[PDB]
């Protein structure tokens, strides 16, 4: 439970930062890459029950790849779906883009 949670926190941090650095105006190939990436991300997540649940979640909520804004909002919303499932607080997605600076800007 301890390790599972630590892996989870690290993964979300990476996840949200990745989406926040996606282009504002991606090319068709970049959109496809993000789409393919998310599918594999869900399938390979290092937790059986987590992966099963996430695969089902992205089927209901396909990643929005048209822009950095859409992608980041999508990420916050899907993370909140997991929060709902786990009886955790619902995160305010209002400043999602600013919450995950890459330190690369």
Ligand X SMILES: Cc1cc2nc3c(=O)[nH]c(=O)nc-3n(C[C@H](O)[C@H](O)[C@H](O)COP(=O)(O)OP(=O)(O)OC[C@H]3O[C@@H](n4cnc5c(N)ncnc54)[C@H](O)[C@@H]3O)c2cc1C
Applying CB under 8 A, the residues found at the interface with its own copies are 1-7, 9-11, 13-14, 17-18, 20-22, 33-34, 36-37, 40-41, 43-50, 101-104
Matching residue, tokens 């390790």: 3
86 binds, among ligand X, its own copies, none (CB under 5 to 8 A by kind): ligand X
Query: DSSP characters for 21-72?
Result: TS-SS--HHHHHHHHHHHHHHHHH-S-HHHHHHHHHHHHHS----S-HHHHH
> What tokens appear for 42 in the block?
């869900």
Is 100 annotated to bind ligand? yes
Nearer to its own copies, 36 or 83 (CB): 36
By CB under 6 A, the count of residues binding ligand X is 20
Is 5 annotated to bind ligand? no
The terminus-to-terminus CA distance of the chain in angstroms comes to 35
Residues of the binding site for FAD: 4, 9, 12, 53, 76, 79, 83, 88, 100
């Amino acid at each position: 439970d301890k390790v599972k949670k630590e892996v989870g926190r690290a993964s979300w941090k990476y996840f949200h930062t990745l989406l926040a650095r996606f282009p504002d105006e991606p090319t068709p190939e970049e959109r496809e890459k993000l789409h393919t990436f998310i599918g594999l991300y869900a399938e390979l997540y290092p937790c059986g029950e987590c992966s099963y649940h996430f695969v089902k979640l992205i089927e209901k909520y396909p990643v929005q790849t048209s822009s950095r804004t859409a992608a980041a909002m999508w990420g916050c919303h899907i993370h909140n779906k997991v929060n709902e499932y786990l009886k955790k607080d619902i995160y305010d997605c209002a400043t999602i883009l600013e919450d995950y600076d890459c330190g690369c800007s």
